[PDB]
Amino acid sequence: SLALSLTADQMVSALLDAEPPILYSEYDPTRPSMMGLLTNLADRELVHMINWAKRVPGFVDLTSHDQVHLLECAWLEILMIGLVWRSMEHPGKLLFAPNLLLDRNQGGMVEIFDMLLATSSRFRMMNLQGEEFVCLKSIILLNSGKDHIHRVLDKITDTLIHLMAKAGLTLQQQHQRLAQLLLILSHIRHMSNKGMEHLYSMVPSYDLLLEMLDA
Amino acid sequence: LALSLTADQMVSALLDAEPPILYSEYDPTRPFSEASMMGLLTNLADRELVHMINWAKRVPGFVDLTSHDQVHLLECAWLEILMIGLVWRSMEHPGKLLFAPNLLLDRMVEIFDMLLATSSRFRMMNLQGEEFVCLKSIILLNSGVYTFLTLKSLEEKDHIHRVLDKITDTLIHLMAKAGLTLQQQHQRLAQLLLILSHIRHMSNKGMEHLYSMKVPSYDLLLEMLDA
Numbered sequence: 348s349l350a351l352s353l354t355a356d357q358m359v360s361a362l363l364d365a366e367p368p369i370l371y372s373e374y375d376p377t378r379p380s381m382m383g384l385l386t387n388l389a390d391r392e393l394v395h396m397i398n399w400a401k402r403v404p405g406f407v408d409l410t411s412h413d414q415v416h417l418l419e420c421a422w423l424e425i426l427m428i429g430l431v432w433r434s435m436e437h438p439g440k441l442l443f444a445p446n447l448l449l450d451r452n453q454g455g456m457v458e459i460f461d462m463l464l465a466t467s468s469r470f471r472m473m474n475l476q477g478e479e480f481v482c483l484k485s486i487i488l489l490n491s492g493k494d495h496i497h498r499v500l501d502k503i504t505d506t507l508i509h510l511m512a513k514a515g516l517t518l519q520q521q522h523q524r525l526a527q528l529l530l531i532l533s534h535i536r537h538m539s540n541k542g543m544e545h546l547y548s549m550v551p552s553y554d555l556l557l558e559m560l561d562a
Numbered sequence: 563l564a565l566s567l568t569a570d571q572m573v574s575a576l577l578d579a580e581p582p583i584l585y586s587e588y589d590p591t592r593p594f595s596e597a598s599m600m601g602l603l604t605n606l607a608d609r610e611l612v613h614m615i616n617w618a619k620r621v622p623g624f625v626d627l628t629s630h631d632q633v634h635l636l637e638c639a640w641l642e643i644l645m646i647g648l649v650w651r652s653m654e655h656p657g658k659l660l661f662a663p664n665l666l667l668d669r670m671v672e673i674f675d676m677l678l679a680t681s682s683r684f685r686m687m688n689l690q691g692e693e694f695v696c697l698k699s700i701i702l703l704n705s706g707v708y709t710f711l712t713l714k715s716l717e718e719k720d721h722i723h724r725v726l727d728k729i730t731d732t733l734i735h736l737m738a739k740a741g742l743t744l745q746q747q748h749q750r751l752a753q754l755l756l757i758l759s760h761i762r763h764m765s766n767k768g769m770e771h772l773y774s775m776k777v778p779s780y781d782l783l784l785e786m787l788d789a
């Protein structure tokens with residue numbers, strides 16, 4: 348409701364404020380296992396994601412059932428785009444955590460690793476902005492999982508275009524960049540799908556996410 | 563040169579390059595079994611793949627790439643391309659999937675529903691044929707582009723993004739010609755491209771269940787391109 352009256356600037360500021368912190372993996376630096384560190388990290392990241400999602404404009408207007416469905420579909424995509432975003436300044440490496448920086452040598456699992464690296468390289472080449480990044484995350488949340496959702500998605504599109512226009516991009520450059528960003532989301536969906544496979548080759552259930560949202 | 567075309571030239575090229583609608587095996591044993599229907603769909607897809615290569619080679623910019631890169635794009639995109647074609651054919655048939663004119667099926671059920679929802683989505687958006695062929699070309703060029711390598715490889719990936727930008731210009735031009743406002747233009751462009759992520763999802767789920775007891779090799783795709 349109120350999310351549909353939000354301006355582009357208000358949408359950006361809201362998403363920037365809802366942004367989760369960068370968490371550390373739990374290991375002792377005084378000491379001389381990887382999948383355990385990632386699992387522990389992803390579990391703590393999940394808690395912050397639920398609170399982030401609740402602060403995404405229009406999301407709370409949805410029924411509790413629809414909120415869970417979106418999170419169930421998007422959670423791995425959200426984690427992955429976050430990883431890719433914070434790894435953007437580290438070519439050839441993935442920054443899972445500030446104290447957990449890995450290259451493909453240490454790295455299902457190499458296939459996904461390379462796809463993650465390629466996305467990070469793509470973001471860096473496009474000079475993806477933080478304001479654009481938070482918009483993409485919100486898009487992933489709302490799109491991966493109907494009328495209200497699509498109105499909000501149109502708002503985020505307006506927000507992206509407004510950001511580009513403010514940055515001095517021409518009208519042609521605006522829709523081109525918009526297209527480039529949204530097409531990357533297809534690769535992110537692909538990575539998540541491949542990712543789920545290897546997670547069933549050893550995940551928050553519907554009830555788990557419902558209980559977290561209620562809290 | 564694909565980058566020299568105009569929006570109208572691009573549309574005309576894509577429309578002319580459209581593959582034919584094929585028929586599945588005539589008069590199969592009905593009712594179907596799980597095996598017999600998969601046999602029909604497999605035979606149909608195999609014959610469709612032939613015309614897809616012919617189509618792909620006529621997509622502006624595609625033949626400019628090395629044969630190796632062309633195969634890689636097809637490897638990543640072929641199922642997506644088959645599925646969006648299916649979704650397009652099924653638009654005027656609510657609740658049904660038109661795999662072929664002689665194979666219209668109503669309500670692997672999960673993928674069926676995802677395909678129905680995508681078809682209804684295209685129907686609700688009033689997707690145009692001109693828009694459709696643009697989206698299909700985008701899939702071909704984009705689905706495998708994020709997995710390239712040298713200076714030559716840098717030029718290859720760079721060339722693809724330019725053609726992709728060109729198709730974006732073409733989609734926008736179609737929308738502006740239709741009379742849509744600039745706001746409606748950016749919004750509709752976004753809606754169409756977000757659907758491509760769903761098509762990716764259905765393709766991945768499709769690949770999964772295909773490996774589940776039920777894919778064209780590099781050598782096959784390469785040979786057909788050379789043929």
Ligand SMILES: CN(C)CCOc1ccc(C2=C(c3ccc(O)cc3)[C@@H]3C[C@@H](S(=O)(=O)Oc4ccc(Br)cc4)[C@H]2O3)cc1
Binds near residue numbers: 390427429460
């Ligand atoms: C109860 N549940 C919530 C438990 C979930 O536990 C999990 C959940 C996710 C993960 C993984 C990753 C991940 C975790 C947090 C994050 O901020 C970014 C990425 C990356 C992607 C996937 S993958 O396993 O799907 O892909 C990769 C595999 C190996 C490597 Br190296 C890189 C990626 C795997 O590595 C690991 C354990």
Ligand SMILES: CN(C)CCOc1ccc(C2=C(c3ccc(O)cc3)[C@@H]3C[C@@H](S(=O)(=O)Oc4ccc(Br)cc4)[C@H]2O3)cc1
Binds near residue numbers: 661670674
């Ligand atoms: C290249 N060759 C070596 C191998 C090709 O073999 C294949 C290739 C494709 C297919 C399938 C489909 C398909 C075929 C042609 C087409 O124009 C559109 C879709 C649909 C989607 C998938 S699915 O089996 O993954 O999804 C569905 C399942 C059931 C139903 Br009903 C509908 C979809 C399956 O049914 C089956 C066998």
